[PDB]
Design a binder for these strands. Sequence first.
RNA 1: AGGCGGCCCCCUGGACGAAGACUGACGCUCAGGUGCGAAAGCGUGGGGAGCAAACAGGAUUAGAUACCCUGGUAGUCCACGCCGUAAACGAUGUCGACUUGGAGGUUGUGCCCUUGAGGCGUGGCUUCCGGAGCUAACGCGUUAAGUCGACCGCCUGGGGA
Lengths: 55, 117, 151, 54
Amino acid sequence: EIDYKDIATLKNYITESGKIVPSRITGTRAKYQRQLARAIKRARYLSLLPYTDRH
Amino acid sequence: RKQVSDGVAHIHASFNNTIVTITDRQGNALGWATAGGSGFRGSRKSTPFAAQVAAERCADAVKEYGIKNLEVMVKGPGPGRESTIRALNAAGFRITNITDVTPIPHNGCRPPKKRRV
Amino acid sequence: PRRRVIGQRKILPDPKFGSELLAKFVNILMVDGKKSTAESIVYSALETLAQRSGKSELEAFEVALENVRPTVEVKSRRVGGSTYQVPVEVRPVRRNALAMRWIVEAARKRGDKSMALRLANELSDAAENKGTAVKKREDVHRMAEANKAFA
Amino acid sequence: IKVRENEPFDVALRRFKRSCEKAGVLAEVRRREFYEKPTTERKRAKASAVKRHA
RNA sequence: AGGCGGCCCCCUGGACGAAGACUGACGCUCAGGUGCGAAAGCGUGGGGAGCAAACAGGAUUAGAUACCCUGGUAGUCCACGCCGUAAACGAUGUCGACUUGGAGGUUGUGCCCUUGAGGCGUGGCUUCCGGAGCUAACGCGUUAAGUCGACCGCCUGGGGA
Ligand SMILES: [Mg+2]
Ligand SMILES: [Mg+2]
Ligand SMILES: [Mg+2]
Ligand SMILES: [Mg+2]
Ligand SMILES: [Mg+2]
């Protein structure tokens, strides 16, 4: 949201299996959901968060 | 022969069938049995009950290594997803952990057309 | 029974022993309304069952009944074009009747010379759980437990 | 998803099955067993919006 | 418009908003013209994991040149170039003005103990309802199918086409 480096804030928005949690469950404003998924997407590329529980 | 005592039960449960494979932590195959094996064909093979006796028959050809603890890896939908683990726990096994491993593409390969039955 | 459920008629007790239960038995064994001849086969078998069992008369009956009593059964069901077999836990009241009905049915399917003898050797066999009717209880469990999966 | 634990269990499984109802596994495998045309997946999405009006 | 969906960069089009300066009718539409334009299709050369017309095989059926199954070639991907059509649809041509409302979603901007994840407004988009009116009716209804104006396209029984 304010940054992909905030893995602390970001972990609260993923499931046990690393899937992005929809705005519905979180009740997050609609603009930031996007900022959030894009920052989660950035953190995944950089191996700061997993794509899947598998690895 | 040989000793393991800490293993893993891999179950492949498709709609037409389910297959049980027992393994060590490394992934080396210890024993296996399938639903189509124990008789049952077509309409009967694809049942939880047929999956149950597969799980039973698999433990009757692996305790040669004397397993005592294991984790479970559930792949596929259909029956014998759920009933297979139960038969396992009753065969004399403390079951430690369960995890679903059904593969999920991140939308890659195109599947077959819908069946117009 | 689409809408109207009912209570059950609670037949009179057996004239000789005063048991509603054994009255439920003669009815199950009775044929063509020959009541007069129905209690005749049931008692004479108990007289044969009593002597040979020794162990009273009222209790001897139940020991055989204790066995063929079935705890569970299966109920047919048609969901998505498939006749699934759903195993239901069955109530005590009916549990004895089945025990009674299979005991009665195996006796005619027997080799002996008369009905009193067929009946006596069936109770005796059942007392040791080793007859036709017990196997019917065992098939019920074999048929059940198979569909243990659905419940 | 994933599951283990407690000395007094074998009912962790009730957990496991409720974890998969939560995760959408069986639903997901059905969705992909067979190809769905884009127009069709657009058609599915509308029908449920409408029903999600009380 | 057709259509565009993982992450990052380079290039680039348009839209909205706040505030004030500048030009000063420079606008609207548009036959002919031009360009764009899904999918299949065609040309050469790539590419080729899945899927799959054709085709083969196995089933089903009275038949089964089909629906099911096992296979599977073009094709679907890239480059360059052709074709220019679709239920290319909101089946609703562009612009501009005017006429009660309620619930939302999206995105800007002013004000308020930022004292809350809000309170007051004010823009552009958008969804569902719904008044008047309009409608053959279904319906539409400030995003009009109402109220009027500018201009283009098109319609004139069905078939034959
Ligand atoms: Mg080509
Ligand atoms: Mg085919
Ligand atoms: Mg045309
Ligand atoms: Mg309306
Ligand atoms: Mg107008």
